[PDB]
Symmetry: C3
Amino acid sequence: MNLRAAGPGWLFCPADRPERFAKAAAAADVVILDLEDGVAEAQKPAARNALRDTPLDPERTVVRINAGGTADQARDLEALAGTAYTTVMLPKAESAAQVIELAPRDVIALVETARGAVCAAEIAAADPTVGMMWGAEDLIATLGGSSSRRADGAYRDVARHVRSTILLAASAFGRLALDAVHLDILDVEGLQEEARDAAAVGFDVTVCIHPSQIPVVRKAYRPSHEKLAWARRVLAASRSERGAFAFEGQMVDSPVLTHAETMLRRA
Amino acid sequence: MNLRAAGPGWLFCPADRPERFAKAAAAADVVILDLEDGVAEAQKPAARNALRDTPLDPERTVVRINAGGTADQARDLEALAGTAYTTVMLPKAESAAQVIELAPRDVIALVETARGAVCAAEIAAADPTVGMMWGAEDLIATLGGSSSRRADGAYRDVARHVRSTILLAASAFGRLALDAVHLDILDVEGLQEEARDAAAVGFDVTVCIHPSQIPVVRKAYRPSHEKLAWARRVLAASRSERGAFAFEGQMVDSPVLTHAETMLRRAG
Amino acid sequence: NLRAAGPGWLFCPADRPERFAKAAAAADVVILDLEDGVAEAQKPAARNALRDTPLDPERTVVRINAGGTADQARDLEALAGTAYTTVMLPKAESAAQVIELAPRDVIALVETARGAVCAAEIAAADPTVGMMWGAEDLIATLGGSSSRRADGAYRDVARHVRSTILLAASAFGRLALDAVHLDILDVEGLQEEARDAAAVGFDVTVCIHPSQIPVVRKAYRPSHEKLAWARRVLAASRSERGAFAFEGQMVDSPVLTHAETMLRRAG
Ligand SMILES: CC(C)(COP(=O)(O)OP(=O)(O)OC[C@H]1O[C@@H](n2cnc3c(N)ncnc32)[C@H](O)[C@@H]1OP(=O)(O)O)[C@@H](O)C(=O)NCCC(=O)NCCSC(=O)C[C@](C)(O)C(=O)O
Ligand SMILES: CC(C)(COP(=O)(O)OP(=O)(O)OC[C@H]1O[C@@H](n2cnc3c(N)ncnc32)[C@H](O)[C@@H]1OP(=O)(O)O)[C@@H](O)C(=O)NCCC(=O)NCCSC(=O)C[C@](C)(O)C(=O)O
Ligand SMILES: [Cl-]
Ligand SMILES: [Cl-]
Ligand SMILES: [Cl-]
Ligand SMILES: [Cl-]
Ligand SMILES: [Cl-]
Ligand SMILES: [Mg+2]
Ligand SMILES: [Mg+2]
Ligand SMILES: [Mg+2]
């Protein structure tokens, strides 16, 4: 499954609403068909049914199953067997074992508890892992907290800390890195801010919970006109330089040039 | 010991000031009698005596002993053997071994050095551990630094980093989580900001160094009437919804409803 | 001995021997660079310069190329015919990479996700005498495009790695070196970074231009106000036992340690 080839705009779609699968697919780069928290306990069997009977392109679809050790997950895997879906998202991911027990599937580990943050490197390193995501809301919920963001809307420190932990663990083992959802759907400004930053630090994906968010996300992962203009400027300049040199008041060498090239590629 | 159901307002009181033990207990939800940095080396023997002579409710009292590998700690423990106290706070906690050697006692590990932060998971996992606290000042001290906060009062990055490290380590192992003391006694504004935020992210306790701070802390761990109203509205709303649903412009699913219920618990 | 020298350390590409003397005079320690400051085609010339224009080995570090690279092998061959005993290892990612540089002392430059994840093991390695972090390769290797946000602060993942390296170094009694300030003429920003670095116990701020050295050296010396407080509170402490209130603050041992650290940095 060529996840890196697909866009940065992924979308959660509750699996007990098969009448929306087609549109989610159309609006998003990758759809995450959700059997976990997006669907009530009593609608999960129906959700599983909808999953076998309403196929989306398995090359552009991931299924979030239920957490390790839950009876629900067992049901999910049985139902999954009647689909073409090769990639699953494991919520409350908390150990390498939880990932290993899903072989031979590809696994996107969703770290959203303190235990998962503590075990991030082991989780990322596990052989089936193809990506890591973080979730601020279960994180806060399982910490015994009540709020992931402060007054002004900025993530509180522990959420910011887990975000970095996941980005690092993912990158250290060559895994996709997926940034967290933006629950305030009409906060397009906040979303744009997060998604631009995500792209800047090397996240590959920002996950969305509403289709109106996908265009914002796609736009944000395209380098700004200003940044792109600089990239061309500094690269042209370096053609005439050997090793370190000063450009526009800044010391420039290898990795700075790599940043500019990455910007060009992203466009 | 039912520490988790004690209240979030803990108060340090140096153990060489027994005449102040009573005020301490009256003011706070839990008192930490201190044999370590709160008490000069020459006064520690008197503090060990005061420990025995002026007993407090052992259900609402923890004793901070001295660090592992010190002559002081050995005497602290000898003195504790003659008390009712079963829960100790271990300063400069730096390894699981330092916690384990304290069994069968319950141990709150106070991580306040780079080594302890680096071993936070191992320390939290140790069997006798029932809680984790962090300390910014010994952290900066042992780092070779000179201030834990920048000009505007915010903690410097390495301190904010260790705070999160300790919250996650504690919570990964089901331990109590205690937030760092607020040393600016007169800065009630900052204490309020910290305690509200601590409450928001799941710290169970904000440790105080002055009784005047306890009310500030207590008020901070109770959600706004505004947050409560919201919690009641979204929970009522969810009763007629299946799974994820949009509410007042927000996407709402399981953990959001948990947040709401947590508000209602911290309150009613 | 490196640990005895000032906090002002200066990179100088080793293909610029005519600059060596000025760098040595301007800075406490000089880091002669064989890696990213020098174009590949210029590396052999840089190695010759390293051999032909020596600096005081007690005040000089050589940054070699990364573990496993053909360049590093050539670097070490060149170095055998020098008096240099401390090297900086870029893209430091394991204890093993440090250990193979024995019997030299090693400053591990952590600047990749893998390096951040393995920071404690790298710091603990026997040859390690210090740790540095590199914001630009960190971002480059994460697949990102900028280490700093619009307001100039480092992005979170950079700030996160900064503390990781500081803690790892300190946990194992290693020197801690803060990242270069690429904006040469931005002495205001450099001052802010260095004052903060000194405050949290970094031992060195690395510079990329001689003009930055004075700024770093001043920032690592406490202000007159801070020095006055330090003398004040230490005086006050002798009349006090254990914890006591001083100027609105609670004071005990570690606060007095901070004071003494200010004094030491002042003479
Ligand atoms: C700062 C001090 C010395 C000033 O004490 P004061 O008497 O000079 O201040 P005050 O405002 O004049 O006190 C007035 C009233 O408050 C009482 N009072 C005041 N404080 C307390 C108290 N703690 N417990 C019980 N009662 C207290 C006091 O006795 C008096 O009662 P009164 O009106 O009836 O006469 C005092 O507040 C105190 O001792 N606080 C706690 C000190 C302590 O325990 N420090 C160790 C923990 S902090 C630490 O080590 C960091 C960490 C984590 O380790 C790391 O970051 O590295
Ligand atoms: C940027 C450059 C090329 C501008 O060079 P320039 O000639 O254009 O600058 P200048 O202002 O005109 O220089 C004025 C005078 O100072 C001198 N000078 C100026 N710089 C130095 C120096 N470093 N050492 C010794 N002398 C220096 C220079 O020779 C000249 O002498 P003069 O008065 O006789 O005319 C120059 O400053 C330089 O080479 N700086 C260091 C470059 C370097 O080593 N970069 C590698 C480390 S940064 C890195 O890789 C990232 C990291 C951590 O790995 C990751 O974040 O990933
Ligand atoms: Cl299918
Ligand atoms: Cl494995
Ligand atoms: Cl003393
Ligand atoms: Cl090149
Ligand atoms: Cl200063
Ligand atoms: Mg979740
Ligand atoms: Mg302390
Ligand atoms: Mg580099």
